[PDB]
Ligand binder design. Structure first.
Ligand SMILES: *[C@@H]1O[C@H](CO)[C@@H](O[C@@H]2O[C@H](CO)[C@@H](O)[C@H](O)[C@H]2NC(C)=O)[C@H](O)[C@H]1NC(C)=O
Ligand SMILES: *[C@@H]1O[C@H](CO)[C@@H](O[C@@H]2O[C@H](CO)[C@@H](O)[C@H](O)[C@H]2NC(C)=O)[C@H](O)[C@H]1NC(C)=O
Ligand SMILES: CC(C)CCC[C@@H](C)[C@H]1CC[C@H]2[C@@H]3CC=C4C[C@@H](O)CC[C@]4(C)[C@H]3CC[C@]12C
Ligand SMILES: CC(C)CCC[C@@H](C)[C@H]1CC[C@H]2[C@@H]3CC=C4C[C@@H](O)CC[C@]4(C)[C@H]3CC[C@]12C
Ligand SMILES: C[C@]12CC[C@H](O)C[C@H]1CC[C@@H]1[C@@H]2CC[C@]2(C)[C@@H](c3ccc(=O)oc3)CC[C@]12O
Ligand SMILES: *[C@@H]1O[C@H](CO)[C@@H](O)[C@H](O)[C@H]1NC(C)=O
Ligand SMILES: [Mg+2]
Ligand SMILES: [Mg+2]
Ligand code: NA
Ligand SMILES: [Rb+]
Lengths: 291, 32, 996
């Protein structure tokens, strides 16, 4: 009963040729209409959103805090001797900082020298297209001391006492607000509380806080944070080739051959946290320089 | 700030809708 | 070696009844007047087994629970659970942080099968439980003569070869061989279907043990008289014992509904594995490994399995079975509720099923005029004229001259169903006089009987003389009844409207044609006459002792004939007409005499008035029957004697060329052969019976229908449906509901199958376009086993779109429950639109939150990564893992909501298959509540506090609720124009391609 393939009375795979043509033509017209309808509605949807601002921005309320070595488990395990053990790290650091070289930021028509001192926020009008393509403040690698160097094509980084720079999640129209001068016990930090978003790293428990001996922060002019002169963001369409602020963190006194946990928590009023997302506001890393 | 959404009001409205639609359906299947 | 055992039981029985009393007593070794010594009786009792059938095969309850956990649908869900745990095992050992989805899903599928088993088991068990409350087996002790003394012992203590005596009223214990009778009449109705009480004489009469009178049978009741006999057969070796043992050892077959579910699964898994395999090859051609592609194959196949269609189909069948139980039409098997509708050939029984199995006064004769009395079982018919003097005389002749009286408890019972002591004919007469002529108690004692004369062995006549209580004449009233040929010879005066006339042939021949009219109608006729004895020749003091001629045998006054027969039940003829209207072939199968079977056939509708048998044409042309061409005869009567000498091809031709067939004098084994002959054609068969002879026929039939009270226990157990009220019209109700639930199951199946497309398409394009997952797993559960359950259950409550009792029965080879048109609708057109609507809501959520749809291509690579917390959208923003996952889950929730929104329109269009929604109407209150509860539940799952934590379903921004509205409206409009072209153009395009 399963050899209905053909017969001398014209049937193929179950039906005739003229029926195959009728059904195929119907399905093509039907699905063509369905595609046109879906496309028209998706076009109306495209007409309900603008090009300079996302309609809903509440799902990114607390900005994240990422690092340069995007580890498979936020763990930095390598050997201070073997150069191939830490190749995966250095490769990502060089590729990340490849857009911050002095040669990359050479056009004066799209780059603006912010300054050697963190200043107030820079609002370049409204988010419309009435103005031309906004300028992006420059950020030379020299600001991250001891984690930039004047190395060749391969940034000879730190084998012993590694470097891990932190970055604030780029958000459109987000205006960072550092904590008030009434700091509720924020782990010794400089007195430059008004024009920089503080970020302080620490251990996680009584063990990690003891294993991690000394940490050295590097930033714009020497402050452990992000300068307000680089915010807010005006979208990729209006500000292409934008360079968000960077801040490096080096762990000098580490206990070699021991996996220790570090939590770099960014402080501020407009900076939220989440017990479910360990990256919203805060940031975790498991460093282990096994010799 | 545009980084805030009154989710409690929408959530409350959705729960009231779910309650009313269910009690209305119950009245529908209880024709008396 | 049970094959040979069953084959020796499909053969009609043999015997040794034709033996001289000496040869019998020599073969068995038994005293003809003393029986045997009690030690010999106990020696046999402990030798071959007590006189009782071996109990039925007990069915333990864990066996049928394990049965409900299996089958065909639950088996598909079982292979689905297995494939889920297989995919999960492949996912666990092979990759880091496996997803628990597959495990959650496998345990849910297992729970679905187990719960369906618990529910269906509780239902079938409830049916059998209420069935056990009908076994009222009262022990019945037999009168056995042993060692020369009469003793009453239990029926099981009776053995082979011993004298047994029976009295009018007692039940024949075992199979007896009569040796001496005294006007003894037994009741072979439950066994051989012989309606009228067949008498039992010691002399061998017919070569067939069933027809002869020298054999009493197991479970038969001696109506009147007393008799003696030697036990020839005992226990299971008896006639009804071999019949019951054959009934238990027969095959049930495959119900049509089950075969439809099986073919349904064939198509479900056919397309499921086609999609899974073609996408397995497609995924390997893209980039994914065998490890991943295997998970894709299993995911697509398991996803294409209707998880909730099992519970919905079960509840559908259960709902229709509920309505069956409401009308006292209980079904033992759940799926048996559907079989009546798919039936196309009903084999019915005459005695006790087509008829009331009770002698009833059919017609009367008075004033040379035939008067039909009401013969309904509940007395709901036309009442004859009861104001003439001829009736006032005939009613007294019958109410007085009759040896029939009511018993003790016969008070609260109705006039018909109450028990009467005596002859069956006298019982029918007593009931008709007690019903249409007041009461017979005070009417019988009003005329004090002086001298009587009972029925005679030759020239059977029954007469009696009574005093006259009239206030105008003291003459003695003499009455007599008997066969019309015996009364015509002893009559000279004729009563008419109150006066007398001579025996003129102008009205006497008019009496003869009336006798042949009521007789040829298959009825038994009797004649009643009376005369006023002259008080001058026989004064009030004279005593007419029953010795010599004290009464004038001739010169009597004939009042009229009174016929009688077992009438059909009340709604039996109308029901047969309804079945024929639905295209159901009605075939009578009974062991009764053909002269009565043909009359009842014409009287109920099996033989349409005007149609002629092969013999009727030869009689109308006065030519030999061997001359007429059987093709000129639409109806035909087939005698059991001729049926014994038939082949397969001959019976096939009997059923193929004759439209109205009546099988008479057929043995239970022949009934089974007939049912098999009907099944050879390929048509669904329903056997409706009551007696033990209907057991092997009800068992082998696609569906057996037993009478709940007028039926025997064996055929009641071997049947598949019970009529607790014996209302044969329930067969019509059943054939209607069986078609109704069939169409509604089609609607419900297309509904659950339409949602599969906007459930698998997210995963499909997730593999192809490499976009983030549009629809979640737990959300799919909240659809297939959450919201959709109430709408799909409500789809069973839909009514008829046209008259279903008008269309012909569905062809099993053509009208499948799930044909290739339903797949073209659900999977092809409606589900496709629903999938597009879901993807629209998906792109709306992502584009509004910053991820333009064009940017979503190839994004899942880094989107699903748990550590890349800087994923660029279309606006240059950096999204963490949990943030974008919150968006993906809050994108799964509206996809689920979109499913419900398009299911609104899908439910309204599936509610009607051909009619328009404006025509049918949203009168289905369960469907209205289905939509309200569906929507309220969908909203609750999104806005309940803690759902993004437990089920990962997050609240929705209200604009999401409207992203699906246009697609639903489109679905509704498209299906509406579809059904409109089906209405206006019933030819072929929209009808043979989409109408399922
Ligand atoms: C960056 O690294 C250099 C080493 O190359 C550090 O220079 C040393 O600084 C200490 C004081 O902390 C002096 O005692 C050493 O003599 C210096 N050595 C050299 C070779 O310069 C420098 O301090 C580091 N910068 C920071 C900010 O920690
Ligand atoms: C850097 O850490 C080392 C420990 O690894 C510190 O030196 C130790 O000091 C303890 C006393 O507290 C001694 O018992 C150990 O023998 C020392 N170890 C070594 C290798 O010197 C050291 O003081 C830390 N230095 C700074 C600047 O934090
Ligand atoms: C086709 C028509 C008749 C169906 C009638 C039901 C429609 C009108 C109902 C069903 C579900 C409803 C939504 C239920 C949930 C939400 C969230 C709530 O916090 C605001 C109202 C809002 C946005 C409702 C809008 C109206 C809505 C879409
Ligand atoms: C011939 C007519 C009826 C068809 C007109 C198409 C209508 C019904 C379709 C076309 C585009 C659709 C809209 C596309 C954009 C939006 C914005 C979104 O945040 C909610 C859905 C919503 C509001 C849709 C509702 C239905 C809609 C208006
Ligand atoms: C585990 C899973 C593997 C493929 C990819 O990594 C995404 C993962 C999460 C979702 C999961 C798929 C597997 C198939 C599903 C259960 C399958 C499914 C869903 C519902 C259902 O009833 O049957 C199958 C489709 C998607 C699925 O739910
Ligand atoms: C905060 O207070 C300190 C003294 O406690 C003062 O030196 C510093 O200037 C203050 N900063 C601001 C921004 O007020
Ligand atoms: Mg499914
Ligand atoms: Mg019967
Ligand atoms: Na059966
Ligand atoms: Rb489904």
């Amino acid at each position: 009963k399963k050899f209905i393939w053909n017969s001398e009375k014209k049937e193929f795979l179950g039906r005739t040729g003229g029926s195959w043509f009728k059904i195929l033509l119907f399905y093509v017209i039907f699905y063509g209409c369905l595609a046109g309808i879906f496309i028209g509605t998706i076009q109306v949807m495209l007409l309900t959103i603008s090009e300079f601002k996302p309609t809903y921005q509440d799902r990114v309320a607390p900005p994240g805090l990422t690092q340069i070595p995007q580890s498979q488990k936020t763990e930095i395990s390598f050997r201070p001797n073997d150069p191939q053990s830490y190749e995966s790290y250095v490769v990502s650091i060089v590729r990340f900082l490849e857009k911050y070289k002095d040669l990359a930021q050479k056009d004066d028509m799209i780059f603006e020298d912010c300054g050697n001192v963190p200043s107030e926020l820079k609002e370049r009008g409204e988010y419309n297209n009435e103005r031309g393509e906004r300028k992006v403040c420059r950020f030379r690698l020299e600001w991250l001391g001891n984690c930039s160097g004047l190395n060749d094509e391969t940034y000879g980084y730190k084998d012993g006492k590694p470097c891990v720079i932190i970055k604030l999640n780029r958000v459109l129209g987000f205006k960072p607000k550092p904590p008030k001068n009434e700091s509720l016990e924020t782990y010794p930090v400089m007195k430059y509380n008004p024009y920089v978003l503080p970020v302080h790293c620490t251990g996680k428990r009584d063990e990690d806080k003891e294993k991690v001996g000394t940490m050295e922060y590097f930033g714009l002019g020497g402050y452990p944070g992000f300068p307000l002169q680089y915010y807010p963001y005006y979208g990729k369409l209006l500000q292409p080739k934008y360079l968000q602020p960077l801040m490096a963190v080096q762990f000098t006194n580490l206990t070699m051959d021991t996996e220790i946990r570090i939590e770099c928590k960014a402080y501020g009023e407009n900076i939220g946290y989440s017990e479910k997302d360990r990256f919203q506001g805060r940031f975790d890393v498991k460093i282990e320089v096994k010799s | 700030d545009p980084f805030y959404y009154d989710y409690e009001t929408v959530r409350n409205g959705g729960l009231i809708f779910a309650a009313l639609a269910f009690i209305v359906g119950l009245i529908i299947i209880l024709s008396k | 070696k049970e094959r040979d055992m069953d084959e020796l039981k499909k053969e009609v029985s043999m015997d040794d009844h034709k033996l001289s009393l000496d040869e019998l007593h020599r073969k068995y070794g038994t005293d003809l007047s003393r029986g045997l010594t009690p030690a010999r009786a106990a020696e046999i009792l402990a030798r071959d087994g007590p006189n009782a059938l071996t109990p039925p095969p007990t069915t333990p309850e864990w066996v049928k629970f394990c049965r409900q956990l299996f089958g065909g649908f639950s088996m598909l869900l079982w292979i689905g659970a297995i494939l889920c745990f297989l995919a999960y095992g492949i996912q666990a050992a092979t990759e880091e942080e496996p997803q628990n989805d597959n495990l959650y899903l496998g345990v849910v599928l297992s729970a679905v099968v187990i719960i369906t088993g618990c529910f269906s088991y509780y239902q079938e068990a409830k049916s059998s439980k209420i069935m056990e409350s009908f076994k009222n087996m009262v022990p019945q002790q037999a009168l056995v003569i042993r060692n020369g003394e009469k003793m009453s012992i239990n029926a099981e203590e009776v053995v082979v070869g011993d004298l047994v005596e029976v009295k009018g009223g007692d039940r024949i214990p075992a199979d007896l061989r009569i040796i001496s009778a005294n006007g003894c009449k037994v009741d072979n109705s439950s066994l051989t279907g012989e309606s009228e009480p067949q008498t039992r004489s010691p002399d061998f009469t017919n070569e067939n043990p069933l027809e002869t009178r020298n054999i009493a049978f197991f479970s038969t009741n001696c109506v009147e008289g007393t008799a003696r006999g030697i036990v020839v057969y005992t226990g299971d070796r008896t006639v009804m014992g071999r019949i019951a043992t054959l009934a238990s050892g027969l095959e049930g077959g495959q119900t049509p509904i089950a075969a439809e579910i099986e073919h349904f699964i064939h198509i479900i898994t056919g397309v499921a594995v086609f999609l899974g395999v073609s996408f397995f090859i497609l995924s390997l051609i893209l980039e994914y490994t065998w490890l991943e592609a295997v998970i894709f194959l299993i995911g697509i196949i398991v996803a294409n399995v209707p998880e909730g269609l099992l519970a919905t189909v079960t509840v559908c069948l259960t709902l229709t079975a509920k309505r069956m139980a409401r009308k006292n039409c209980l079904v033992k098997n759940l799926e048996a509720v559907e079989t009546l509708g798919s039936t196309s050939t009903i084999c019915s029984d005459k005695t006790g099923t087509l008829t009331q199995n009770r002698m009833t006064v059919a017609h009367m004769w008075s004033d040379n005029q035939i008067h039909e009395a009401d013969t309904t079982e509940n007395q709901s018919g036309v009442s004859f004229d009861k104001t003439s003097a001829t009736w006032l005389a005939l009613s007294r002749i019958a109410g007085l001259c009759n040896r029939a009286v009511f018993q003790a408890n016969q008070e609260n019972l109705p006039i018909l169903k109450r028990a009467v002591a005596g002859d069956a004919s006298e019982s029918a007469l007593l009931k008709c006089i007690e019903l249409c002529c007041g009461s017979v108690k005070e009417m019988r004692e009003r005329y004090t009987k002086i001298v009587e004369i009972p029925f005679n062995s030759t020239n059977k006549y029954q007469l009696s003389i009574h005093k006259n209580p009239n206030t105008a004449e003291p003459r003695h009233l003499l009455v007599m009844k008997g066969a019309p040929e015996r009364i015509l010879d002893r009559c000279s005066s004729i009563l008419i409207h109150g006066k007398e006339q001579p025996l003129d042939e102008e009205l006497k021949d008019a009496f003869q044609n009336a006798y042949l009219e009521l007789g040829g109608l298959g009825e038994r006729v009797l004649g009643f006459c009376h005369l006023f004895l002259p008080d001058e020749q026989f004064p009030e003091g004279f005593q007419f002792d029953t010795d010599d001629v004290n009464f004038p045998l001739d010169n009597l006054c004939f009042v009229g004939l009174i016929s009688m027969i077992d009438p059909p039940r009340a709604a039996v003829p109308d029901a047969v007409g309804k079945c024929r209207s639905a295209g159901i072939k009605v075939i009578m199968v009974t062991g009764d005499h053909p002269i009565t079977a043909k009359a009842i056939a014409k009287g109920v509708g099996i033989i349409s008035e005007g149609n002629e048998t092969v013999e009727d044409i030869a009689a109308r042309l006065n030519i030999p029957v061997s001359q007429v061409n059987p093709r000129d005869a639409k109806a035909c009567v087939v005698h059991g004697s001729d049926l014994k000498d038939m082949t397969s091809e001959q019976l096939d031709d009997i059923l193929k060329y004759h439209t109205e067939i009546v099988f008479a004098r057929t043995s239970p084994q022949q009934k089974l052969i007939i049912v098999e002959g009907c099944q050879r054609q390929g048509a669904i068969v329903a056997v409706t019976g009551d007696g033990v002879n209907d057991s092997p026929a009800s068992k082998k039939a696609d569906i057996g229908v037993a009478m709940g009270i007028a039926g025997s226990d064996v055929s009641k157990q071997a049947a598949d449906m019970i009529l607790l009220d014996d209302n044969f019209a329930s067969i019509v109700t059943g054939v209607e509901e069986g078609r109704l639930i069939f169409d509604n199951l089609k609607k419900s199946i297309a509904y659950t199958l339409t949602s599969n497309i906007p459930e698998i398409t997210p995963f499909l394009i997730f593999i192809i376009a490499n976009i983030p997952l549009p629809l979640g797993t737990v959300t799919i559960l909240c659809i297939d086993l959450g919201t959709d359950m109430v709408p799909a259950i409500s789809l069973a409550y839909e009514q008829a779109e046209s008259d279903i009792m008008k269309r012909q029965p569905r062809n099993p080879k053509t009208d499948k429950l799930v044909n290739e048109q339903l797949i073209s609708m659900a999977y092809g057109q409606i589900g496709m639109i629903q999938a597009l609507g879901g993807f629209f809501t998906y792109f709306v959520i992502l584009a509004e939150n910053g991820f333009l749809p064009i940017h979503l291509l190839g994004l899942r690579v880094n989107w699903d990564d748990r550590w890349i917390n800087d994923v660029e959208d279309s606006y240059g923003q950096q999204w963490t893992y949990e943030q974008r996952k919150i968006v993906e889950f809050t994108c799964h929730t509206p996809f689920f909501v979109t499913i419900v929104v398009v299911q609104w329109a899908d439910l309204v269009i599936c509610k009607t298959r051909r009619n328009s929604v404006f025509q049918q109407g949203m009168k289905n209150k369960i469907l209205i509540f289905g939509l309200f509860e569906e929507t309220a539940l969908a909203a609750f799952l999104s806005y309940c506090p803690g759902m993004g934590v437990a089920l990962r379903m997050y609240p929705l921004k209200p604009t999401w609720w409207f992203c699906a509205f246009p697609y639903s409206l489109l679905i509704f409009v498209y299906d509406e124009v579809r059904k409109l072209i089906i209405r206006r153009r019933p030819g072929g395009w929209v009808e043979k391609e989409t109408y399922y």
